[PDB]
């Protein structure tokens, strides 16, 4: 029927991909910019991150399906360089197309990519070193990880707080941090502000002066089924269907109310002492009107609306366990964080559970009145947390600022593929795809993406220099010495995710509509 085949068919693909990637050149580093995305929600989405932009709103393309995988994959395997990958592949395609514009087989162009990547892989294995997982060494990476994804001024104000969270680990082996991400957000007078909180914070509390404002010894009773019920991990059935059933429904519920609040107040005396310690009730549901001020005046702090994520982080953080219920039970089961402090900022009541038995859960309170800012900065925290963790999980960190890309392109020195000349193109196409990031920065910086880059190489070819384009002024400098470092796991993973799709490109010569 309708079939597009061979050389002319793959054009639209490489026309799309290379055409689709070149918009992301506005991104990847502080001289690049956050790209505005809007959806049917009309939400202005400001991200220099490729993944965010890529998977939300775009133009229909056959390549649009495949590219949505890789920037996800690099976000998955790292949390950084999702903007990076995209600009390499079409740069390789633009290279590759020339040889196919030379008529030289996409098959012979395909089969030359892989050694070249391995070369650079092996080479990036060479130009890597085992670096510190030290917070300051992470700052070197955190500064660098954030900027190539999120904004530099954001990066700077994030750099200390991002590392501090991933530094709070127990020495987890995780390349990204599950519970070190606890994101509180707020409408503020600062469209962008982020507070750094180790431990867990509550979605909502309930603060009363009757309740203890400061609970120092905090036995946290964190419960889904709430005060309205009586010795229940499960809600009780209502019947409003008929009069006489509803007539007996509203009278006895206060017993369910009374015993429950009683369950705590006698248990605080048990668990927390009388006034001796502070008590913490968490109501993950509403708080009863009697029980609200009744738990209040007994020294108990009843907390309205803690999440199920607050539920799990608390248990992990404070070493206790969340209940469904307020019944008399030992203090240890009841969560204990060495501080429960309900910090009401804005209109939102944030209950800290702090001095946690595990500083696994750690929280960041994001701020803004403007949502798009609250979108940006709250999004700006995560990638580094995932990125910079790849510095603190890995003893190795690969040096950043594109200094290593000029380094392989010549280290790929050719007729090393004396084999055929298809791999010699596969390397020749690949050597240039390396440089798209060193290009795009000096591009996004002053002067030339090339004149500096060839300076970089002419420099880097000089001994003792692993030298690179500045992410800012675009000028030559040695990158590893500035500390500017992309996460180690990025590059090696990046190269695979880069080459495969561009490799997948040439194997598809047919498209059928």
């Amino acid at each position: 029927a309708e079939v597009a085949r061979a050389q002319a068919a793959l054009a639209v693909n490489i026309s799309a991909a290379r055409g689709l990637q070149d918009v992301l050149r506005t991104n990847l580093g502080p001289k690049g910019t956050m790209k505005m995305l809007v959806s049917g929600a009309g939400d202005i989405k400001l991200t220099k991150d490729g993944n965010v932009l890529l998977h939300e709103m775009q133009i229909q393309h056959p390549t649009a399906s495949l590219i949505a995988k890789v920037a996800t994959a690099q976000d998955d395997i790292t949390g950084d360089g999702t903007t990076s990958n995209v600009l390499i592949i079409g740069e390789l395609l633009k290279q590759a197309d020339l040889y196919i514009s030379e008529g030289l087989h996409p098959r012979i162009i395909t089969e030359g990519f892989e050694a070249a990547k391995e070369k650079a892989l092996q080479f990036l294995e060479e130009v890597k070193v085992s670096r510190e997982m030290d917070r300051e060494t992470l700052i070197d990476v955190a500064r660098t990880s954030l900027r190539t994804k999120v904004h530099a001024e954001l990066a700077d104000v994030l750099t200390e707080a991002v590392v501090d969270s991933i530094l709070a680990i127990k020495k987890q082996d995780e390349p990204i941090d599950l519970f070190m991400i606890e994101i509180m957000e707020m409408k503020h007078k600062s469209e962008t502000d982020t507070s750094l909180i180790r431990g867990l914070v509550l979605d909502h509390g309930a603060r009363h002066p009757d309740m203890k404002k400061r609970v120092e010894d905090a036995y946290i009773l964190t419960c889904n089924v709430s005060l309205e019920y009586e010795k229940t991990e499960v809600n009780s059935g209502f019947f409003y269907k008929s009069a006489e059933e509803r007539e007996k429904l509203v009278k006895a519920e206060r017993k369910f109310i009374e015993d429950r609040v009683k369950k705590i107040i006698e248990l605080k005396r048990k668990v927390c002492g009388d006034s001796d310690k502070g008590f913490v009730v968490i109501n993950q549901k509403g708080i009863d009107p009697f029980s609200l001020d009744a738990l209040s005046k007994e020294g108990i702090v009843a907390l309205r609306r803690a999440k199920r994520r607050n539920m799990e982080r608390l248990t992990l953080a404070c070493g206790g366990v969340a209940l469904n219920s307020f019944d008399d039970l030992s203090p240890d089961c009841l969560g204990h964080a060495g501080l429960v402090y309900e910090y009401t900022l804005g209109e939102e009541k944030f209950t800290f559970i702090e001095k946690c038995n595990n500083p696994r859960s750690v929280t960041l309170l994001i701020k803004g009145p403007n949502k798009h800012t609250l979108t940006q900065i709250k999004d700006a925290v995560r990638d580094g947390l995932r990125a910079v963790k790849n510095a603190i999980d890995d003893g190795c960190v690969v040096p950043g600022a594109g200094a290593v890309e000029v380094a392989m392109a010549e280290a790929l020195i050719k007729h090393k593929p004396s084999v055929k000349g298809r791999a010699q193109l596969g390397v020749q196409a690949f050597a240039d795809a390396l440089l798209i990031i060193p290009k795009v920065l000096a591009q996004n910086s002053g002067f030339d993406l090339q004149e500096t880059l060839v300076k970089i190489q002419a420099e880097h070819s000089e001994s003792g220099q692993l030298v690179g384009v500045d992410l800012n002024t675009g000028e030559p400098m040695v990158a590893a010495e500035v500390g500017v470092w992309d996460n180690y796991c990025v590059k090696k993973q990046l190269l695979h995710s880069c080459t495969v799709i561009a490799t997948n490109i040439l194997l598809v010569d047919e498209i059928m509509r």
């Binding site: 001289k31 910019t33 956050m34 790209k35 809007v38 009309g42 400001l46 403007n370 996004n444």
Partner: protein
């Protein structure tokens, strides 16, 4: 509608917003504002000076324009002075890019340029802040400071509102020296004169008020949207109008139902029973004889006005109010608020933060005008609580800034030398905008403003003397600004200007 490619979002959608930024401020700002008609989702005419209001009134398509709209409301809430200004400077600031785009500068470059320059400008502001005035027990002191503060958004009788808007905020807080978001209710009541607008501390229900007074002394209100016509939301007792015999028996019970009504109200107690719902004669004839005060069929606004201030929750359903569901006022005394007979409560010692100022204009847009102006008078006193720090009227400050920033521009070098020197230029749009409203050119003003070379005090106001555009000391003239009012204005305008600059196209199918 929204998504576009081909540099339509940046050089196109952005600058078009800057066009909107003009004449929402340009003639609508300065020491005076100017009015621009607004027809409403249910059609009617609104004249407006201040930016944020009319632009909130404008549902805006451009995501570019959409972002700065937010900052003006942040300003208006926070500040209120230069709420018009947040547009013009940001627009005059953003329009500087296209030439730099033809010059070839980078968004990453120029954002930094205005950034360190507004961080420089924020450093320069304190000195162009000229003297200070604060007495928050003094209406007349607060008046003149609010006078130009309202005047900047008001062309009208400036001192009288200034008096009144200073009257309340001074007298509504015994602790003035602090100010809270809404400290002044206004019951908009047309008729009489514009001077018939009057300050009355404590809640005014502009509504009809019935029931025979048992206590005018205390007002404790069980607060209700509940109809006392006999209608409770959960199960309604609605009057039967389709039969004469059914109405005959029900009205005889509406006396005694309202008895069971007024009591559960006044069991936990009420002096006024605040009624947002409907009332029946047999309910009222009883409530008259029962002697509880029904302020009847109350405006949801009056209801909200009450629900906010007394800290009580109106009950749609009829049910005994608990302490959360009952409000308390100093007094309930039936009195004309602006010569319009209603019930006016008193709150000074009760809570405060409510001074109910009857707004009496000749037309509703005048009654919108006096409503428009105090918006800054509200916030500028709040600014005046936050600082007495005083700046002269706008346009004197911005020239010294330009003097700073231009030479601060040549001390940049690197392409931001352009951007910072541009940041100096967005300052001069105000005297222009002022010269526009007053019908002259900035260039003369700019020439004169640089002529004396003073920088932060002498300026052309919004003037009839602008016939020949003419400078005057703005500080002494009473046309005045404040550090915050100027500081926040620069901080939010540049922010909203530089953040809309980083934005890019939206790829969309």
């Amino acid at each position: 509608a929204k998504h576009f490619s081909g540099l339509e979002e940046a050089v196109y959608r952005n600058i078009q917003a800057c066009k909107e930024l003009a004449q929402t401020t340009r003639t609508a700002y300065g020491p005076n504002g100017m009015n621009k008609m607004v027809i409403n989702h249910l059609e009617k005419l609104f004249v407006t000076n201040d930016a944020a209001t009319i632009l909130r009134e404008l549902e805006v398509q451009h995501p570019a324009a959409k972002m700065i709209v937010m900052a003006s409301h942040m300003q208006e809430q926070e500040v209120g002075d230069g709420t018009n200004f947040v547009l013009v400077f940001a627009g005059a600031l953003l329009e500087l890019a296209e030439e730099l785009l033809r010059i070839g500068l980078s968004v990453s470059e120029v954002i930094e340029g205005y950034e360190i320059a507004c961080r420089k400008a924020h450093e320069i502001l304190p000195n162009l802040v000229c003297c200070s005035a604060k007495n928050l027990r003094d209406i007349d002191e607060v008046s003149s400071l609010l006078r130009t503060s309202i005047m900047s958004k008001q062309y009208g009788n400036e001192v009288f509102l200034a008096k009144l808007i200073a009257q309340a905020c001074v007298s509504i807080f015994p602790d003035s020296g602090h100010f809270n978001v809404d400290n002044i209710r206004v019951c908009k009541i047309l008729g009489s004169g514009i001077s018939s607008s009057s300050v009355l501390h404590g809640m005014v229900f502009k509504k009809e008020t019935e029931g025979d007074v048992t206590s005018v002394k205390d007002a404790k209100i069980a607060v209700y949207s509940c109809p006392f016509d006999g209608m409770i939301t959960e199960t309604k007792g609605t009057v039967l109008i389709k039969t004469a015999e059914e109405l005959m028996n029900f009205s005889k019970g509406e006396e005694n139902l309202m008895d069971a009504q007024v009591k559960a109200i006044a069991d936990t107690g009420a002096n006024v029973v605040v009624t947002g719902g409907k009332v029946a004669d047999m309910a009222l004839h009883y409530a008259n004889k029962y002697n509880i005060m029904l302020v009847r069929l109350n405006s949801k606004w009056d209801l909200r006005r009450l629900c906010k201030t007394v800290g009580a929750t109106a009950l749609p359903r009829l049910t005994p109010p608990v302490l959360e569901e009952m409000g308390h006022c100093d007094s309930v005394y039936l009195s004309e608020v602006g010569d319009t007979q209603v019930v006016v409560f008193k709150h000074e010692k009760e809570d405060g933060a409510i001074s109910t100022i009857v707004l009496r204009g000749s037309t509703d847009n005048l009654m919108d005008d006096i409503e428009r102006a105090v918006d800054d008078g509200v916030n500028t006193f709040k600014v005046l609580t936050r600082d007495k720090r005083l700046v002269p009227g706008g346009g004197a400050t911005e020239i010294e800034l330009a003097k700073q920033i231009t030479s601060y521009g040549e001390t940049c070098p690197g392409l931001e030398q352009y951007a910072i020197k541009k940041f100096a230029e967005a300052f001069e749009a105000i005297p222009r905008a002022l010269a526009e409203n007053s019908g002259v050119k900035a260039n003369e003003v700019i020439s004169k403003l640089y002529a004396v070379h003073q920088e932060g005090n002498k300026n052309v106001g919004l003037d009839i003397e602008a016939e020949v555009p003419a400078v005057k000391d703005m500080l002494e003239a009473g046309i005045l600004d404040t550090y915050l009012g100027k500081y926040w204005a620069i901080k939010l305008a540049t922010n909203a200007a530089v953040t809309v600059l980083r934005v890019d196209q939206i790829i969309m199918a």
